[PDB]
Design a binder for these strands. Structure first.
Ligand SMILES: [Mg+2]
Ligand SMILES: [Mg+2]
Ligand SMILES: [Mg+2]
Ligand SMILES: [Mg+2]
Ligand SMILES: [Mg+2]
Ligand SMILES: [Mg+2]
Ligand SMILES: [Mg+2]
Ligand SMILES: [Mg+2]
Ligand SMILES: [Mg+2]
Ligand SMILES: [Mg+2]
Ligand SMILES: [Mg+2]
Ligand SMILES: [Mg+2]
Ligand SMILES: [Mg+2]
Ligand SMILES: [Mg+2]
Ligand SMILES: [Mg+2]
Ligand SMILES: [Mg+2]
Ligand SMILES: [Mg+2]
Ligand SMILES: [Mg+2]
Ligand SMILES: [Mg+2]
Ligand SMILES: [Mg+2]
Ligand SMILES: [Mg+2]
Ligand SMILES: [Mg+2]
Ligand SMILES: [Mg+2]
Ligand SMILES: [Mg+2]
Ligand SMILES: [Mg+2]
Ligand SMILES: [Mg+2]
Ligand SMILES: [Mg+2]
Ligand SMILES: [Mg+2]
Ligand SMILES: [Mg+2]
Ligand SMILES: [Mg+2]
Ligand SMILES: [Mg+2]
Ligand SMILES: [Mg+2]
Ligand SMILES: [Mg+2]
Ligand SMILES: [Mg+2]
Ligand SMILES: [Mg+2]
Ligand SMILES: [Mg+2]
Ligand SMILES: [Mg+2]
Ligand SMILES: [Mg+2]
Ligand SMILES: [Mg+2]
Ligand SMILES: [Mg+2]
Ligand SMILES: [Mg+2]
Ligand SMILES: [Mg+2]
Ligand SMILES: [Mg+2]
Ligand SMILES: [Mg+2]
Ligand SMILES: [Mg+2]
Ligand SMILES: [Mg+2]
Ligand SMILES: [Mg+2]
Ligand SMILES: [Mg+2]
Ligand SMILES: [Mg+2]
Ligand SMILES: [Mg+2]
Ligand SMILES: [Mg+2]
Ligand SMILES: [Mg+2]
Ligand SMILES: [Mg+2]
Ligand SMILES: [Mg+2]
Ligand SMILES: [Mg+2]
Ligand SMILES: [Mg+2]
Ligand SMILES: [Mg+2]
Ligand SMILES: [Mg+2]
Ligand SMILES: [Mg+2]
Ligand SMILES: [Mg+2]
Ligand SMILES: [Mg+2]
Ligand SMILES: [Mg+2]
Lengths: 159, 185, 58, 172, 60, 61
RNA sequence: GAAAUUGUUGAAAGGGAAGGGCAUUUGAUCAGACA
RNA sequence: GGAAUACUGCCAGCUGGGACUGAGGACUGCGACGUAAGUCAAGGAUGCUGGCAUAAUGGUUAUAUGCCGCCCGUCUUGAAA
RNA sequence: AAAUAUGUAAGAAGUCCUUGUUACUUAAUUGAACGUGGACAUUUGAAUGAAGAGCUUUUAGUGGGCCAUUUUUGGUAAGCAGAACUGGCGAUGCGGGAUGAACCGAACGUAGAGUUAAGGUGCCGGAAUACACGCUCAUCAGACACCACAAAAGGUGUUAG
RNA sequence: GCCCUGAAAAUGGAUGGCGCUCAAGCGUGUUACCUAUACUCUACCGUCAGGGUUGAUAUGAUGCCCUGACGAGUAGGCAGG
RNA sequence: GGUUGCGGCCAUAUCUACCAGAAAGCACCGUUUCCCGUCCGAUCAACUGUAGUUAAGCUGGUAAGAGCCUGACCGAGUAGUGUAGUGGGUGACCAUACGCGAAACUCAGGUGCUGCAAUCU
């Protein structure tokens, strides 16, 4: 009959990475989390306590609690036509901060500068990002670069 | 044909008249449809809808809920509008003066109100005394204090009061309500 | 008589009829499942900043 | 694919920071409109270098007109093509008055004799057989004999009324 | 029109302001035996570059 | 026009800028369409056949 | 004193069923409107 | 050397034949032409002429003709079965 | 180690400054959390769209399903049995595939003009017995997807290589 | 490549039928042409929606007027009759 | 720069073989009364820093070395794949259209970086 336990189907998911087994490097424990940090979730197969169920593997969420050896993460999991709120208790080995926001933060303080830098200058800002624009006209020179004519090849084999 | 992005022929789902059939209501509404078309004042638009409201959505405002709203900082001379009925509240002793403008004043209410030198005002009187609704305070009854809502939302771990007649122990208080009878909600 | 066993055919049509409603979000979430030592202190903490923010309109 | 045109098409890989001004390659594409011709161009470059449209740019696109459009010519044609059971290299000779006329009838031949649709054919080279007796194919050679003449026997005047009152005649 | 064709700074507002045009079918026809192949394959769909003007005009 | 000639004069090739504006026509009926294109045909306001709208060109369109 | 169903009389159509839809010829029949 | 033409495209260039439609019902708007008074093809047909004033046009009906049309109800994945 | 598919982010619930509260926490007015006061508006922080968004209560029918392309399990197979995504039939007529639940085209208020789709234009039957270049002659020729089947193997018939 | 052999079933019979052989057959190209309940323009019905209008001294305020979009349907809901 | 004590990243740090290392540090090394541990003062514990040495640990350098790391229009726009068609084919399968795009291969270049504290010709 079918089988459906808590780690079923997690063969490679909780595997270790090639030549990467053993002790977990100590930096994993000197990281510090506060509430409100966004973290990404990757189970560490060695550390069996405080493990995320396979579903939250690859998922990302907000820290909502901080305790001795773990953090509480909330994840919106969609079930049926709708999300519910699942909160996870995860040990600090199955969690890493998320760079998903770094660009944003980077961009803000980036923005806030040219914002002032050009205010104290002479207005004229423009600081929304814009999608890639189709490129402009341009002239290509032939000097040192006459076009090398090519043609399709015939059929061969070599075997 | 058209990839319809949205359901076709939807009604707005907001009332348009009172579902009432009382002339006098019908008349008041005549007033304020006029008043709300031709006077760019928000208060009239608000009042007009409130007349279409049905009994449930018109929960009673009490005279004691009124006195509190005048205890509002800087709001002691404004005139309370209530698009519903006003009821008496024996629990307050020193009810103030002012002017209440409502659909209906229960006997005790209007009594208490005038007993302190107040004034009770049909909304059409309120209309003429203050077209643009100048200096009004609209109060609203507690919609969700109806007994019926106690039972809305029922399900496990929801804390919500069974639809149940005869109550006491022996009435849904065993298995599924306590860790020592199967389980708890 | 056997009969079909299981399918999810048509199931997402249905889920989409009336949404997949985005999670909905609030400023001030619950403290549900937050450490008790924290909540306990935090309480008395707030009580204070309350009390002394009353002495501001004295 | 239609009535054909010829096209100098010239593209290059997109300029980069370490490689501004890349190498520039030409093909002479035989197609019906420019749009198809650029498409074919990319088709063959991706089958020769490491570019694709996304990573490259078209630099120019110019139709080449016949040199002497009113002179009969003997063409040698070279073609890679796909049959049902494997692919094949080929040489035919077409005798017409332009490269465009020729390439037209080529494709019509491939269609007819080897059931080869336009997708299934690469023109390899098309060029003008200059000195005769470099003409290698009977069905063309035949037309080079001197003081050539022939009848057009059993002729058929196409009628224009449904009935006729004579009884026709194929003299010519 | 100037705002459209030159893709102006206010092109979002400009463009959206126009209700999606409603053309008839082309007056010649599609010029193809079968519409739902790519242009390049002798069908009608995909980018056909400047050749869109001949069509839209037939349908206008 | 004179750019194109002036570069031809120099032996150089003149490549004009990528087009920035396109005009789209829904050329297909309403039914048997897969979901993701179906949405995009909406978001581009082409929700019925032979109707056309203008599209500003960037990657994200 | 309805219907099914039947006799008569009148009209009509009918090359292995009948009945139906759009349309008009033909026949029969009828309104309204002119002023 | 200097032309022409094809081809593709543009014109707020001119112009002919034909078909369907004529909603609206004082005025009001945007314009156009006029030096002007005016005028207009500019927020939906008017002018002129003739025919019957009737079964002419029209309804209804029967039949003929062209094309089309399987028995309804039901249960069912599926019924003319 | 892909392609497709899939979690999060793209601001006012934002970013900084000053320095209160506590019983938690620190060697520590250390920190954690929650605040008070202040500084910066819509190029306020990508695109496209939006006949608006949000929320509540109650109740029907249903809970035998089947088909298609693609992914796919069992089986020699099946118009067989069983899954995955989407589109459909069921519940739906209309044009095409003569015919036909499921293919193609296209989804229906009553109508005039126009244009088309898919599919066609010898005659049945509206529409070129059109143009063009080759191929094919069958004493069981062949003739349009789904589709109403044919294979190995052969031919000094003929065509081009 | 086309063609021919390989190629055997039971009522008489099917490229849909007649018939077609420089095709009315196969492969391919170019035009034109035919016609869906679809598309475009218009009238009319209805549904939803957004405006306007209680001013008497005439006739519906659930009304009157302007405007825009939309219209498939079993089981099933509701509504107006 | 060296070295030590504590480290971060965890082979560009490993592996094999040779050679070289001033000074300081580490090291090996002396001892068995004492705390301590063993079948064995080898390991472990204690004592000296005294009697000895760079032999080894350690550090560096060499090698058409093994491994490992980086790169490239090397292979390869290949394999695979998302979309399309009343495309081809008896089928198996296959081309084409708009996109996305590997792994092996081959060639070249490298062979620890660095944080806190003390020390040292
Ligand atoms: Mg199992
Ligand atoms: Mg290990
Ligand atoms: Mg355990
Ligand atoms: Mg009670
Ligand atoms: Mg109570
Ligand atoms: Mg079964
Ligand atoms: Mg079942
Ligand atoms: Mg030439
Ligand atoms: Mg025309
Ligand atoms: Mg025509
Ligand atoms: Mg014409
Ligand atoms: Mg066709
Ligand atoms: Mg037109
Ligand atoms: Mg748009
Ligand atoms: Mg009697
Ligand atoms: Mg009739
Ligand atoms: Mg009129
Ligand atoms: Mg009229
Ligand atoms: Mg009469
Ligand atoms: Mg008469
Ligand atoms: Mg009769
Ligand atoms: Mg009859
Ligand atoms: Mg019939
Ligand atoms: Mg039954
Ligand atoms: Mg059955
Ligand atoms: Mg039946
Ligand atoms: Mg996504
Ligand atoms: Mg998503
Ligand atoms: Mg946005
Ligand atoms: Mg918009
Ligand atoms: Mg809106
Ligand atoms: Mg329900
Ligand atoms: Mg139910
Ligand atoms: Mg049920
Ligand atoms: Mg399908
Ligand atoms: Mg059923
Ligand atoms: Mg259908
Ligand atoms: Mg039919
Ligand atoms: Mg058939
Ligand atoms: Mg299709
Ligand atoms: Mg016939
Ligand atoms: Mg005909
Ligand atoms: Mg086929
Ligand atoms: Mg054979
Ligand atoms: Mg042969
Ligand atoms: Mg046959
Ligand atoms: Mg035929
Ligand atoms: Mg043919
Ligand atoms: Mg013709
Ligand atoms: Mg119609
Ligand atoms: Mg309906
Ligand atoms: Mg509907
Ligand atoms: Mg020394
Ligand atoms: Mg001892
Ligand atoms: Mg010793
Ligand atoms: Mg020791
Ligand atoms: Mg040594
Ligand atoms: Mg050491
Ligand atoms: Mg090596
Ligand atoms: Mg693919
Ligand atoms: Mg196929
Ligand atoms: Mg292949």
């Amino acid at each position: 009959g079918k089988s459906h336990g808590y780690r079923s189907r997690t063969r490679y998911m909780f595997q270790r990475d090639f030549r990467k087994h053993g002790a977990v490097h100590l930096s994993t424990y000197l990281k510090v989390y506060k509430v409100g940090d966004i973290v990404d979730i990757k189970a560490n197969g060695s550390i069996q306590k405080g493990m995320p169920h396979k579903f939250y593997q690859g998922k990302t969420g907000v820290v909502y609690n901080v305790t001795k050896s773990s953090v509480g993460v909330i994840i919106n999991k969609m079930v049926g036509n709708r999300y519910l709120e699942k909160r996870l208790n995860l040990r600090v080995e199955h969690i890493k901060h998320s760079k998903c926001r770094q660009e944003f933060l980077e961009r803000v303080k980036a923005n806030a500068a040219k914002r002032a830098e050009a205010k104290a200058q002479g207005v004229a800002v423009q600081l929304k990002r814009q999608p890639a624009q189709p490129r402009e006209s341009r002239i290509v020179s032939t000097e040192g670069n006459v076009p090398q004519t090519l043609a399709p090849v015939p059929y061969e084999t070599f075997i | 044909g058209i990839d319809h992005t949205s359901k076709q022929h939807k009604r707005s789902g907001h009332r348009t008249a009172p579902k009432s059939d009382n002339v006098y209501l019908k008349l008041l509404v005549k007033l304020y449809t006029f008043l709300a078309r031709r006077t760019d004042a928000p208060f009239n638009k608000v009042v007009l809808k409130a007349l279409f409201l049905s009994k449930i959505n018109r929960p009673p405002v009490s005279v004691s809920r009124i006195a509190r709203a005048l205890k509002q900082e800087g709001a002691a001379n404004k005139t309370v509008v209530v698009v519903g009925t006003v009821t008496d509240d024996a629990r307050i002793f020193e009810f103030p003066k002012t002017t209440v403008a409502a659909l209906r004043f229960t006997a005790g209410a209007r009594a208490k109100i005038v007993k302190a030198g107040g004034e009770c005002i049909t909304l059409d009187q309120l209309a003429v005394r203050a077209p643009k609704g100048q200096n009004t305070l609209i109060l609203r009854g507690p919609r969700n204090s109806r007994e019926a809502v106690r039972h809305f939302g029922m399900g496990p771990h929801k804390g919500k009061a069974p639809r149940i007649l005869s109550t006491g122990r022996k009435f849904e208080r065993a298995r599924g309500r306590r860790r020592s009878k199967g389980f708890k909600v | 008589a056997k009969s079909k066993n299981h399918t999810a055919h048509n199931q997402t049509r249905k889920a989409h009829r009336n949404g997949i409603k985005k999670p909905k979000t609030y400023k001030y979430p619950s403290l549900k499942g937050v450490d008790p030592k924290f909540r306990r202190n935090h309480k008395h903490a707030l009580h204070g900043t309350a009390k002394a923010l009353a002495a501001a309109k004295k | 694919m239609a009535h054909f045109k010829e096209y100098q098409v010239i593209g290059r890989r997109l300029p980069t920071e370490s490689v501004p001004e890349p190498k520039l390659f030409r093909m002479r594409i035989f197609a019906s409109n420019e749009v198809i011709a650029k498409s074919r161009y990319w088709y063959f470059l991706q089958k020769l270098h490491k570019v694709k449209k996304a990573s490259g740019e078209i630099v120019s696109i110019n139709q080449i007109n016949e040199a002497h459009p009113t002179k009969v010519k003997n063409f040698g044609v070279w073609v890679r093509y796909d049959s049902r059971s494997g692919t094949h290299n080929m040489y035919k000779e077409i005798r017409d008055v332009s490269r465009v006329a020729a390439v037209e009838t080529l494709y019509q031949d491939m269609a007819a004799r080897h059931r080869a649709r336009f997708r299934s054919i690469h023109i390899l080279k098309v060029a003008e057989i200059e000195k005769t007796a470099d003409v290698k194919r009977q069905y063309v050679k035949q037309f080079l004999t001197k003081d050539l003449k022939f009848p057009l026997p059993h002729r058929v005047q196409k009628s224009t009324k449904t009935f006729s009152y004579k009884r026709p005649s194929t003299f010519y | 029109i100037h705002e459209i064709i030159t893709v102006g700074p206010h092109f979002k507002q400009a463009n959206n302001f126009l209700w999606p045009f409603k053309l008839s079918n082309p007056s010649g026809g599609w010029g193809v035996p079968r519409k739902f192949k790519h242009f390049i394959q002798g069908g009608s769909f995909g980018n056909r570059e400047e050749f869109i003007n001949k069509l839209v005009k037939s349908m206008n | 026009i004179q750019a194109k000639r002036d570069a031809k004069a120099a032996g150089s090739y003149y490549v004009e800028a990528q087009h920035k504006l396109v005009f789209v026509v829904r050329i297909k009926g309403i039914n048997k369409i897969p979901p993701k294109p179906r949405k995009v045909l909406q978001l581009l306001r082409l929700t019925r056949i032979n109707s056309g709208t203008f599209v500003k060109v960037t990657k994200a369109t």
